[PDB]
Design a protein around this ligand. Sequence first.
Ligand SMILES: CC(C)S[C@@H]1O[C@H](CO)[C@H](O)[C@H](O)[C@H]1O
Ligand SMILES: CC(C)S[C@@H]1O[C@H](CO)[C@H](O)[C@H](O)[C@H]1O
Ligand SMILES: [Mg+2]
Ligand SMILES: [Mg+2]
Ligand SMILES: [Mg+2]
Ligand code: NA
Ligand code: NA
Ligand code: NA
Ligand code: NA
Ligand code: NA
Lengths: 1015, 211, 174
Amino acid sequence: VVLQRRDWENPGVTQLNRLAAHPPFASWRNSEEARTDRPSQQLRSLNGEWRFAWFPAPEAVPESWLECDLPEADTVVVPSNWQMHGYDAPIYTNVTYPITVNPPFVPTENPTGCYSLTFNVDESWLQEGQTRIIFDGVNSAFHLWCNGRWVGYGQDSRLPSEFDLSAFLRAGENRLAVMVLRWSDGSYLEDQDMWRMSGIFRDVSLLHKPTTQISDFHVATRFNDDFSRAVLEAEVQMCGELRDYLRVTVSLWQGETQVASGTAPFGGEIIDERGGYADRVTLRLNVENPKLWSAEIPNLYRAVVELHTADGTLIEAEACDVGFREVRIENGLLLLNGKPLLIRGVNRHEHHPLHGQVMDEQTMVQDILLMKQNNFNAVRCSHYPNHPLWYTLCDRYGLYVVDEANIETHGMVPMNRLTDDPRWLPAMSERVTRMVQRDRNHPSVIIWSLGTESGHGANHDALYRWIKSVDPSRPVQYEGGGADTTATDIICPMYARVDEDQPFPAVPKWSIKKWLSLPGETRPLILCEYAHAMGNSLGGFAKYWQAFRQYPRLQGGFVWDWVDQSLIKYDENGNPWSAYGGDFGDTPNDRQFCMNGLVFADRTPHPALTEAKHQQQFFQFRLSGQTIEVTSEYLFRHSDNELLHWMVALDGKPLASGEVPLDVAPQGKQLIELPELPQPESAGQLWLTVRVVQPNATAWSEAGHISAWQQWRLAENLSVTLPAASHAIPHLTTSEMDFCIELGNKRWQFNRQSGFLSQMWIGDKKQLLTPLRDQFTRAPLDNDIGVSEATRIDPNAWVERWKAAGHYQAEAALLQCTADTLADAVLITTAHAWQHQGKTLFISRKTYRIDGSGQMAITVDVEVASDTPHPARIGLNCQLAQVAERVNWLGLGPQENYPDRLTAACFDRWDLPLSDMYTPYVFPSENGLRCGTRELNYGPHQWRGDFQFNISRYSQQQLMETSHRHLLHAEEGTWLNIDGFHMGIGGDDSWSPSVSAEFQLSAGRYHYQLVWCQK
Amino acid sequence: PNHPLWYTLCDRYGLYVVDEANIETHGMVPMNRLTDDPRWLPAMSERVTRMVQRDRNHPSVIIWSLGTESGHGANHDALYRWIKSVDPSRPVQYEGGGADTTATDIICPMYARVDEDQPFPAVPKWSIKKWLSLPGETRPLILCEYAHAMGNSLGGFAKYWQAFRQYPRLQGGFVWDWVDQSLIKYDENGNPWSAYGGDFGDTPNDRQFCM
Amino acid sequence: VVLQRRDWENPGVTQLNRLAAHPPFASWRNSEEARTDRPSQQLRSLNGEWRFAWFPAPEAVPESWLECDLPEADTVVVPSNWQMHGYDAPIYTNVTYPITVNPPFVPTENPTGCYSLTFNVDESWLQEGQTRIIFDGVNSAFHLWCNGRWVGYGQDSRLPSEFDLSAFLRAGEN
Ligand SMILES: CC(C)S[C@@H]1O[C@H](CO)[C@H](O)[C@H](O)[C@H]1O
Ligand SMILES: CC(C)S[C@@H]1O[C@H](CO)[C@H](O)[C@H](O)[C@H]1O
Ligand SMILES: [Mg+2]
Ligand SMILES: [Mg+2]
Ligand SMILES: [Mg+2]
Ligand code: NA
Ligand code: NA
Ligand code: NA
Ligand code: NA
Ligand code: NA
């Protein structure tokens, strides 16, 4: 009958014989174990070695598999995704569905995972009460059998399905058989931009509950206006036989202290003409001066819910952590405990490079710590309810959570084709209702979300009202269909820009500043997604935080996103590499679009992470004279674990430093008076650097963790001294093909046919492998490429503008190349015109002045045609012969930084191994730039001026011809790119031009100068 | 929802119609046990959605109703909003759980009296004159059921109509009801007689209350 | 499948293969007839004499009935309530449920009406287009079979259940 029905092609059937959803249960039989949250003997894990077979369709499954283990089957670990064991390929597709859009039908070729487990059940479990099995995550649908007999069916990949097995089990050995379908009608609601995988990918467990049981419970906390008094209100529901002697005690614990308690018989107040719930009771406990919960200080109490007899004999106990906090939207602001929030948030998919979409404690804890260490206070569960441990950890470490229903229909045309259809309302309701029923007691959850990218349909409106109806404690948000519809309490656009309107028809993304004040609008604005961190990105991130700070109603947003969705593959030798869309044979695919992380799949930071930590700082700084003004952006806590380290350096040389403890109240100010700074009698720029240090370890950080920093230029003393003139004067050696300049061991050569420095010699040895030439291009970034492909060009992307204008294949044409012997130097003048198909793109006018001290002063003046697309950069490159261990520079650093992403970088003297000057982006592009650099040192070379540079063993050309990082080979010598000017990287999104006007190279005429010498 | 022809006739002869979903859970304890249970939302929604999709073009339909005597549950709320979302042209009314919940655009009590308060716990039937002016209340009041016409009845009918006329916001009501639900039985001689509850062997029954 | 599933004791199955609801259709092929609201050749009444048998439970319904008329069955007029024909009793209850309140379950003794009809279909409806059957009201749930093959299932006594019979029909007798 199971093959006959095809429930996996019926959106009307989303479960069979499935128990109601409810908050996390453990069925403790001792109230103390409940209080302390110790393991419970009534909740057994079924995780571990299971038997697995793969089949191309459910019709291909043999009927014997219900009765006997299959010999051809293997033994695999559960939980797991079966794509992660090599049974089939994972598919990466963004928008377009991984299957043909023919609702409600799926392909007849429907990969089918048959899982089985022979396991033991004790006698005690079967003489009394109720034995249920819980599947926390099954992708995407499944039928369940126990000892040959059919139990039930379930959908929704991301919420627990629970089945009563009491009537199916026997003492001793038992066998489960689980038929998991890759594709079902649920897939239509699971079109998240992520790897499409399947199987039993979350925990499986058995729970024993008494016959008379707690079947549900809800905890609410309400406050007076100043938060000095709370009422905890706990509503408890039982199943079983209703008897007079039945009682519930809800008791509230702070550590080992019981702060409050209440006990009542069942039978709530009269509700309507037929009475009340005889199977319910509401307990109300008064709490004076409650410790409030926030992400800053996650104060938790323990609620123990005891079901017992009048006389005091326990039946069972459940429990949860309670955070006393109010979430309300008042007067257009989202308030926590009466204070306006500034969401420093991130989107976080559940992703692991080895285990796929299986989650474990270690990884979750690792994620939380990195998040907090980098100044995040919020996470969006993009785009499904998470592993249940996640909320628990968020409660305990303190993050604000957006809990999001598992509904995404992005690939539909138009996006709301299902969500407007009343026939898909049942399947949608269950994905929202079952989330609320499960997660509503977690204080970390502050906002409910109706899903993502499903357009705006009437079903959203119904479910919005439903949530507001059952849970008035939390705002409901939803971005779809324009981000400000009647199904959202919060204007929550994705990738809406700061100042720039993008007025799309029907779904405009307004400038977020403009959006707030549209006629009639009053709601707060928090971006559900912003700052697409794909490859070398996060350009313009500071612009967001400047606006968030200035506008009370701009209350932050969630970065897209936390971690790259790269997956580990292995080569012939056996070494791992990071893989994206299309690397498992999967087609069609959206390639590197699965990697948008602030961190790599192994949780190593991208350079952008540091930019986020800095902009997301909690202490603001202003300098007047010798006074640092510190302002706190904390809402609740004092800076009771903070000192300020100040430091003054002259072009990187330390002159003074000190420490002052920070004692600033939430939203408050502290003035720090620096001691007399010693005026240096030496040319240079004085810089002030302050760093906020946490001297003590926390649950989330180590002692000496730096949480904030800032810099200022203090006094500058410009160099008025002429260098001591030299005896020697360089000699010019004119040839047919060459101008050679000699001075001591040093020699320069200008090729008269190309017009460039073709070679330099120090003593005997050659310094160049490639001549010094102008460069106007870069290995295109993900943002430069957007959605452009080889077989579907987007002529709007920066890369295509560059290609079509001939930037990548323009040829230097020599207009001029003269030599002149001066009094104490040799002067080489040049002029080039870069042309493509008769159009002059660029003109470079240079002079090289080689003086008697062996220094070469290079002066570059570039004309850029007003009607050519603005170039990626205006600089020079060459390939040096030298491979040295270290790079030393006076500029912004130490990490990679670009004109629109340099706020986190500090001006100082930095020294790193060459390998740190390369950023290993999985899709290779221009990388490792450092800006505002006054001096660069590499081997015997030193460059001086005011430039940006990158330095690496990889040419711009190899970076742009290579698709994966691991396929890069180190070239001979070191590619040096020195830019006078470099275009922003953008990232407001990654599918249109996103580089802001003020970071484009549009001036038409550009000037830079460099001195080159041996030291 | 009625036989489709009823709406056509009302369109053409001229009657205002309250079109009502086929949802009644009166015998539940308490009355909202189903309608507050999310597992019953699917079944409930199809009873509301499929009504609106069918009858939304009839001009005679001026008010949608979410059903009757099913208490007030969160499912009413979702469905209220569903209708308001798909058809802003018509008010949505529903009596359950006190006649003035958030699932109704109209205070629509049943058998609320003119001057006499009946202060039942949780679900009081206030005097309709009094109901209109309860703190914060602004809605119109039309009784979904009044003047129970059972047997020799309709005493005090004039009192309703005097109040309906004097109070702009008391905008009338629906008598309970049009036609006796008596069925024809035939005796030993084959002579027709009027039958109510209990006359078909039916037990437990509620006797003449079908009339 | 049909009897093992017990779709009538499941609030999650309220229909199987039912067509989407919609305002009244007549599929006129002449604009003037549509304007005047005159009859339409594309909408046929199947009201009249059908065949009917009563059963104490769905378990008691013989499998032969899907393939052939039951000889003991009577000819009755449809539409009708089978209590008005005297097959069992109509029950009058006000508030209290006519059955034991135990959701989602109903009594095992569940009176089953077995209605059948033999009818012809116009030549042209089989070659081209879509032919659906509409049941304006069925109390309280039903399974539908056309020519021995199962079509679908319906709930809600008071709204039309509709099913595509396009692939079920044959020339001559259905
Ligand atoms: C127009 C498309 C690029 S949509 C775009 O794709 C992104 C790729 O990372 C993210 O998934 C966003 O959520 C989505 O809005
Ligand atoms: C308290 C009960 C009498 S309820 C009362 O019964 C009436 C009897 O005809 C009607 O059915 C009303 O709708 C109902 O409210
Ligand atoms: Mg299904
Ligand atoms: Mg998407
Ligand atoms: Mg059913
Ligand atoms: Na703000
Ligand atoms: Na993506
Ligand atoms: Na590349
Ligand atoms: Na009036
Ligand atoms: Na009656």
